[PDB]
Amino acid sequence: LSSSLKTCYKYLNQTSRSFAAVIQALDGEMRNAVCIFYLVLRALDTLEDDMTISVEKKVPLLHNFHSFLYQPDWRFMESKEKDRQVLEDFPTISLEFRNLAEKYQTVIADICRRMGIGMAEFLDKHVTSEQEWDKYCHYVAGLVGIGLSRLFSASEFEDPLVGEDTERANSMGLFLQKTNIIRDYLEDQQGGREFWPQEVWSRYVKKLGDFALPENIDLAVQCLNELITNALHHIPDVITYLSRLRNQSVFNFCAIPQVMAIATLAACYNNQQVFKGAVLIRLGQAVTLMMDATNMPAVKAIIYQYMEEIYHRIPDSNPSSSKTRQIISTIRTQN
Amino acid sequence: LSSSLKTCYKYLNQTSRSFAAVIQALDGEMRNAVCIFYLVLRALDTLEDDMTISVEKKVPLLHNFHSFLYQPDWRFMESKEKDRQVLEDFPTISLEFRNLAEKYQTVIADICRRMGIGMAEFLDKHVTSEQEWDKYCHYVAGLVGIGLSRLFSASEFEDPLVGEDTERANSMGLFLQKTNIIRDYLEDQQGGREFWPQEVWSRYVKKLGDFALPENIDLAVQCLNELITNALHHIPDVITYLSRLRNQSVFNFCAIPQVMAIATLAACYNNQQVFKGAVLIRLGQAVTLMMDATNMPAVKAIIYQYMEEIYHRIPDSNPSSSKTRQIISTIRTQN
Amino acid sequence: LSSSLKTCYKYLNQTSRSFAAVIQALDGEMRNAVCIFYLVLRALDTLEDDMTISVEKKVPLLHNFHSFLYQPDWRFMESKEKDRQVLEDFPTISLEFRNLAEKYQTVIADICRRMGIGMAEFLDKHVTSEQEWDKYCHYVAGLVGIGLSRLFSASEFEDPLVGEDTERANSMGLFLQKTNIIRDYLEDQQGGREFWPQEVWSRYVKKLGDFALPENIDLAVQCLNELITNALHHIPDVITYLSRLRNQSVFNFCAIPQVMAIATLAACYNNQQVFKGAVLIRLGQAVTLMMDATNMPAVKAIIYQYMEEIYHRIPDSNPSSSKTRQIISTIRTQ
Amino acid sequence: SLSSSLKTCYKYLNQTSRSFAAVIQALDGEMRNAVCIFYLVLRALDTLEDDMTISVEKKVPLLHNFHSFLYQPDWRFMESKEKDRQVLEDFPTISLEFRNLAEKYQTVIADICRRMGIGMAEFLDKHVTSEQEWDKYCHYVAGLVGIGLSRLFSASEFEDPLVGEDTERANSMGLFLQKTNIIRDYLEDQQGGREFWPQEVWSRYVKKLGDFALPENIDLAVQCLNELITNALHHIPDVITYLSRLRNQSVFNFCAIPQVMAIATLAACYNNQQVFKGAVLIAVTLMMDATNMPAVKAIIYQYMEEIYHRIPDSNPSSSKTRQIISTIRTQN
Amino acid sequence: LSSSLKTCYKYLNQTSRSFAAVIQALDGEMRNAVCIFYLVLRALDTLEDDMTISVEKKVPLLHNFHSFLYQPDWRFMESKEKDRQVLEDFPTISLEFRNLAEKYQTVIADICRRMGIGMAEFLDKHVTSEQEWDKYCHYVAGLVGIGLSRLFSASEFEDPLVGEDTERANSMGLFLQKTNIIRDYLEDQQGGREFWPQEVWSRYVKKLGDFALPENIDLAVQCLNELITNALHHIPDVITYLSRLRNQSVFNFCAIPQVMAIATLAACYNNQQVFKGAVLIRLGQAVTLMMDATNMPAVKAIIYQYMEEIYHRIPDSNPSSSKTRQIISTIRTQ
Amino acid sequence: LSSSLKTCYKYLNQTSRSFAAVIQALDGEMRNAVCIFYLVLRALDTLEDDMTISVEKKVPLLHNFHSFLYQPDWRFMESKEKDRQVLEDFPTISLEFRNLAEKYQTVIADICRRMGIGMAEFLDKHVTSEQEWDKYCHYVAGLVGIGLSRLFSASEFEDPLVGEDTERANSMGLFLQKTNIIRDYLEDQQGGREFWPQEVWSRYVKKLGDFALPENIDLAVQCLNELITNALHHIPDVITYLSRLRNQSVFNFCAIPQVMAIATLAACYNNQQVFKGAVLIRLGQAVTLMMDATNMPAVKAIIYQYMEEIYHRIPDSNPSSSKTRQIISTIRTQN
Numbered sequence A, B, F: 001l002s003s004s005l006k007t008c009y010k011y012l013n014q015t016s017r018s019f020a021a022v023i024q025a026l027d028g029e030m031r032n033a034v035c036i037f038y039l040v041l042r043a044l045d046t047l048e049d050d051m052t053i054s055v056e057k058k059v060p061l062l063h064n065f066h067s068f069l070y071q072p073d074w075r076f077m078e079s080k081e082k083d084r085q086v087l088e089d090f091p092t093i094s095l096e097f098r099n100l101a102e103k104y105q106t107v108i109a110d111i112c113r114r115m116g117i118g119m120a121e122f123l124d125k126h127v128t129s130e131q132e133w134d135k136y137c138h139y140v141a142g143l144v145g146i147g148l149s150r151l152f153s154a155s156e157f158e159d160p161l162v163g164e165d166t167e168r169a170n171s172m173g174l175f176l177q178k179t180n181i182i183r184d185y186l187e188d189q190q191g192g193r194e195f196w197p198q199e200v201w202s203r204y205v206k207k208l209g210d211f212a213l214p215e216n217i218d219l220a221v222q223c224l225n226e227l228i229t230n231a232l233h234h235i236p237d238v239i240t241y242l243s244r245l246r247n248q249s250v251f252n253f254c255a256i257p258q259v260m261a262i263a264t265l266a267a268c269y270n271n272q273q274v275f276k277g278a279v280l281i282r283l284g285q286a287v288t289l290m291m292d293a294t295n296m297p298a299v300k301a302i303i304y305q306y307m308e309e310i311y312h313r314i315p316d317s318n319p320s321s322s323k324t325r326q327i328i329s330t331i332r333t334q335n
Numbered sequence C, E: 001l002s003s004s005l006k007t008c009y010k011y012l013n014q015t016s017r018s019f020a021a022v023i024q025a026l027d028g029e030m031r032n033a034v035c036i037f038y039l040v041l042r043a044l045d046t047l048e049d050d051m052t053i054s055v056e057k058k059v060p061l062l063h064n065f066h067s068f069l070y071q072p073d074w075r076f077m078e079s080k081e082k083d084r085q086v087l088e089d090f091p092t093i094s095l096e097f098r099n100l101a102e103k104y105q106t107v108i109a110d111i112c113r114r115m116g117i118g119m120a121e122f123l124d125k126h127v128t129s130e131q132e133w134d135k136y137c138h139y140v141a142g143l144v145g146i147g148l149s150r151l152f153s154a155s156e157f158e159d160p161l162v163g164e165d166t167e168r169a170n171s172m173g174l175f176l177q178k179t180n181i182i183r184d185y186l187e188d189q190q191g192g193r194e195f196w197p198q199e200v201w202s203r204y205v206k207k208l209g210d211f212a213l214p215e216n217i218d219l220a221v222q223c224l225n226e227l228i229t230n231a232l233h234h235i236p237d238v239i240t241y242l243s244r245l246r247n248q249s250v251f252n253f254c255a256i257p258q259v260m261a262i263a264t265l266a267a268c269y270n271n272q273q274v275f276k277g278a279v280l281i282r283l284g285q286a287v288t289l290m291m292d293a294t295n296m297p298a299v300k301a302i303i304y305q306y307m308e309e310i311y312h313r314i315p316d317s318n319p320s321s322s323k324t325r326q327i328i329s330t331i332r333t334q
Numbered sequence D: 001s002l003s004s005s006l007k008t009c010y011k012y013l014n015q016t017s018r019s020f021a022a023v024i025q026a027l028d029g030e031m032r033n034a035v036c037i038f039y040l041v042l043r044a045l046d047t048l049e050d051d052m053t054i055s056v057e058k059k060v061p062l063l064h065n066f067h068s069f070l071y072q073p074d075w076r077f078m079e080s081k082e083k084d085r086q087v088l089e090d091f092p093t094i095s096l097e098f099r100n101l102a103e104k105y106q107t108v109i110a111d112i113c114r115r116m117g118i119g120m121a122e123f124l125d126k127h128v129t130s131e132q133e134w135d136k137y138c139h140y141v142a143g144l145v146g147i148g149l150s151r152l153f154s155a156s157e158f159e160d161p162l163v164g165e166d167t168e169r170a171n172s173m174g175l176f177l178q179k180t181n182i183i184r185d186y187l188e189d190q191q192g193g194r195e196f197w198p199q200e201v202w203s204r205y206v207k208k209l210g211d212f213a214l215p216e217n218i219d220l221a222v223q224c225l226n227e228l229i230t231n232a233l234h235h236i237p238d239v240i241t242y243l244s245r246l247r248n249q250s251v252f253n254f255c256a257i258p259q260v261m262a263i264a265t266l267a268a269c270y271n272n273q274q275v276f277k278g279a280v281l282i283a284v285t286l287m288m289d290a291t292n293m294p295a296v297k298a299i300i301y302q303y304m305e306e307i308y309h310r311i312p313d314s315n316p317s318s319s320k321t322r323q324i325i326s327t328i329r330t331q332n
């Protein structure tokens, strides 16, 4: 009934392309909790992205963002990004945050603190190792999967296990983040951002930006398949995690984005287009045509169908061909 | 093995484009009760539309139609309409009506009696105020939502509350009827039928027929968007009503047509093609692709997706622009 | 993390174009049990189809196939089939089979044995009568539907009532098989074998190969509608059988294949393309574009929409029209 | 408000039914009225069969056409002198509600009424002789009813299609109840001039069935009582199988409770001289009711042991009784 | 292991002869929420019944009782009633109240607030019409059935439709209350408390206390039967309300007390003993002892047997005979 | 249709007045396993209790009994007990023991082995401390609770937790055993056996037999209430144990005997009749009557009512009054 809450949801739909719909469809207290949660992370993320903010002035913000949640008057009017109104009109957001049950804000604020730490940390460096890729993805998405699970277990809509297995929840976050990192190479590159792991791309070319160069299209695709193969290893945890949910609204919120990500990886696999523009979500085969992602067995079938689309297009001489068949074979056989 | 019951279903399939399937999919008792309810209403509508029937002769028929249900031999042989078979062979349909449990009989007859009254009432006039629009929609559709709701409750497949809350039931009907009226502007025009509320279109043109003329397309679309905005006010009730359903076959029957109507309004909003012919139902955003309208959370997600599709296309100039944002905001925040 | 199990699933995906995913989606012990069940039946079918194997050497292999399951070192390297890797490497499959629980093994073996016997029977004869056509289908598909039902109950993921209803489980199989046969006419014509009952086509033309003759397209399409009408008679049992299920993974597994088959028949009905080439699962109505085969009410709606897509195309010319409408009518009032 | 005719039917149900009104009224949705009406028409038919003031010549056509009177709106019978005659004199009210039932239910009920009428007519001139004939008679008046009820459960979709298809198990449900009642109502019937115990059985004990009423034959009476009960016990395995297939709670309650009461009646009558002098009066159990399958099994097993340890070694059925009880005990 | 919570359950058992067991049997959070709810109502009721508290002092206590839940030190030490311990040690009870989740606190406080106003309203008067009887029963019990329903839904153990149906929840309360009021005629008369509606008993006697007079036994039993007939009218709602429940612990909690009340009315119907002391629930027709009140179909059967017990004892001469038959007919038929 | 298996069931019904029915009602594989388990224990108990079998002969019989299960022809023809038939025809029982799945054999044999040793350990002594009472009861009943639980988990009709939590399984047996020992005081006394713990009764009289003396009735009842109070301490575990069962047949089997034991204790509490003969079912209350022990909530309510029947009788002057109120209070407020 609130006017500020009405504003929060307006922002959610303003800044979110993939989650407003499933968030708003969440039952009870999760609706506003997840909604608010998304808004604070957006504002936080909007800070790390504004390069017009000196590193000397930005480190503080990231580190003490979790504290601005309790500062009714706090805000930021010195941002030029496109999602500024959430910082400028942050008071409206912080307000609703404080209207949440403590237990929920005890989770959201903890994550905001821990994320701000990781984000600041990677502020003056790029991802080198695959281990550091995980690490970075942990700070910006893995902790969100962890934070979301704890919110679910806290509302009691889901068993406490969900919130306890930070590992599985971590994978949920990593799979989405890696998928988007892979798919947005060109966009990120043209923006001056580099997220692909140097220890992986340096085996192909001198510098990451070279993949934007058409003469390197063959090497680029090869690196793409290696990165995708890497992300595929999280699928086992995704299935395990999804298979433990019992609340329908929570399952949709969780399953749908994951399936959309898997669908994106299948479309991007061995696809030169990843280096020319944006990629389009191929719906599944003739079987998936008759099924959606709202029940576990169907989500399984859909995933397996997307694996065969990848498996069937694997180039014999691709340097990762063996690795790709290995993980896919593991996904087919695991139960 | 009843030839008459078989004949009824043959008729159901010959006249119901979008309901035969979901109707025949209803569990047990509701199947025949809803099939027959559709057929009798179908016959009533056929009489109501037959312009070759003099008013003086049509009024008593609409008024007394409900009584023919109990007259074994009653039938109408002077109709030229396409679906005239349900009138010429009414004895077959009325016979099955009399075979339904008494509790379903009383609901259908009562609704038929009240609908006939309202249909005759609007035979000599057109819709003036937006209030008359609601009254007209109530008589030919709202009452149907209420009738169906009463059958669902009486069958025990759904809670007593579904049949009791007539306002929510009424909204289900108004939303479908308003959507179809908005969608079929042109077709009705080329038929001497005017359903758009006078007190609304008279603010853009002086002759409803003027919207078909393109010197006014810009005004016609303004009127179009206003009416759609009116119709959107029923969605909160539609969500509330669907949220109370617990029987899957009933949920399918109720939700699917509602979701299709919402998809339709989104495909007509600020769309010039409405005044040039038929419109198509673009799928639902990337997410929707993975969601069937067979569970409440999914239906919500879908409904929100469409709301944003409309919200994203609101011209700042459109005279209803702020009302359209207002209702959409109320729908997305309201839990 | 078993090596041989991973291989079985590699063959599952390899040989099956439409069951792999739904099989891998099955709950607990049904997963490997049905996968293995599909591979063995696959190997067995591979033999029957291989025409290089003599009529005297084939019969034995068919009759004893079920025993090979317990004979570790048993293999077969003298086949020219595209899916011979299952025969050549049968030990990998027999091993995992032997790793299944006793309850599952029993079922699978029994079906293989009975199927074997049946397949041998039609090695020298042909599909003459419709009753005969049911007989064959019962052997190559009907019994499989029963085996699956039994596995569901044995797994106890489904009520004991499922495995008991052998009559409708058999119908599940008969419907799919008659459908594949009807849709795969030309490919089977240009292949050497004919599965369409002579008693039915013999009343249309003198040779099944004659349907491939453009100068008979009419007679062709008419014989087509006639057979399809025959397959539609199984739908009531399919609906009843599916209505009984309570496990989501089992329902998806049973319902999606059946629905696709129905979509198939609706595409083939009164269609010439069944004789020139192969058909497309043309889109469904507007409503169906909303639902998917994962819950019974939705499966009913989808079925009804295909029945109407067919019914509205019935030409009152067809010697079958009367019968086509008759069964659909029955399907509508159930 | 709605149908006062239906209210009259439930009034008759409670008027004529001593043991089923409550569980029938408790059935879910459609089964409720269908089973109520089914009970009432059978009750009218039985009232005609049992009325001895109606000559056999006049009675046979009524029994043969009863199933058709269901479709004759004004038909009724005003010459019955039986205590339950109100259902015949006001049959129009009952057939009216019978005709308001969905057709799939009418079909089942009329069919059972038709077949039962034929069977009842067939037994008006003859007595029950062989055990095979005893089953036949029980099939007509009760076996077909179990079959009828089962077909209604499947037709309603509250139970699996199998329930109505397995006519043998459904038939056993009826026989067990009817044999039990026949065994328990020996005296009452003898005093009414009606004989139901198989002649080929009681003849091996006395010359005239009415002799068991005589104290000087009590020992022989009890021996016969035990042979019949022993016979009746053979239906239990089928009863258990039947109940174990039910999935609807209201249907389970309706089917099991009557069967348990009948089993409790046999246990109370076994080797009991009371069956021949007056009326018979019906510990782990007392913590359980007959509303879930495992509990029903337990209750049945307890009753079986009650009979088992009471079996007189001298009794000539002694071995037959132990064998069937052992068979029930070890049955899966 | 809270000592204060330990004390609350101790108080629950000291004051509730017929609810402690089913309350302690409730799943998860409903357990404490309903225990506390019972205790605070027990205190409020003791205040209402204490005739040593003047009306001008009592009105504020009743009106503001709900606010006392949030006053840690509030308590009442001037009561002479038998259950005054909950009032004298109210802080221990209000403490556990404040420990309950906010969603439960809100429902309990709201019902105390509303009940406080209703009780106060009736301090200066006796129940007159049957409409007034319903209003009074609504205030002291109807609101509790409504409150309990909201607690069930708030805990998620029950569907939200349960708390939403205030009409039937209200009937659940009126039924228990009217039954107790009927049963306790004598005990209330000897206590100087009159609850039987005046517009009803004044048609039989000059003073409600006259029913305690042996020479009016006949006019007393008739009034008794008229009140029971009135109470029977809530059974349809009771059955409807119970059919909606899905959680076993909640079902037992709601069904058992209703069934005991039904057994009580049957025992009291046309029973002279009502005016000479308490009445014994013995009851049980054939079927009964082979089924208890823990599943809906059984509950229905048990209720039907009790309705038949009453129906079979309805005297022709009784002024309510027709009405009594009508309502039971309605119960058994629909 | 095995003649040896039905002979086994004949013996079960012949030697078990209160478990034969619920055992026979057990689902699938549990049925035979539990039937056989009961028979072998019945045979073992028949040896232990036979006083015509010398200590010299008995010790080897109790210690090796478990091995006789594997010896096809082992039998014992010198028993003078009433149930000697199971010993003389042991090959029939052992044959069926060996036909059970190996996993069940492991359990049954293990328990017979452990029980054998425990019984042997007590042939030469009486029960002294309360710690020893627990030990004796563990050997003859607690181990059975553990064994039965392991059979349930092995069969998979119950979760592995049922079999793993041996402490709760042990409590189920101790409760029943302690209840039987309390109830059978007088019968055992006239039998020459003493089971009441000496460290408890000695604090009241010189010899256990003195409680049977009319002049010691007051002291006797006091002792009785102390032992009963002791037994009540297992109730929380009984509730915990039963609350975890998922299979209806297993629930009935475990719950009914437990509730019956609770009713017995309630009936014996502060009851002088315990020392003049036997006692029985204090028929419950008004709430009880309306509920059976086939669902957990109902079992809880039934148990709580009996706790109150006891609570209501605790006389302030009983030496154990405070201890009795304490454990009962603990039983009331534990979730």
Ligand SMILES: CO[C@H]1CN(c2ccc(C#C[C@@]3(O)CN4CCC3CC4)c(Cc3ccccc3)n2)C[C@H]1O
Pocket: B019, B023, B034, B037, B038, B041, B042, B045, B140, B141, B142, B144, B145, B146, B148, B149, B169, B172, B173, B176, B253, B254, B255, B257, B258
């Ligand atoms: C409460 O939710 C329900 C509301 N629904 C409605 C509402 C109204 C109608 C209608 C209608 C008509 O009067 C309009 N027109 C077409 C059908 C009849 C006769 C002429 C219809 C059509 C209809 C369907 C089935 C039986 C009767 C009518 N459906 C279906 C669910 O969304």
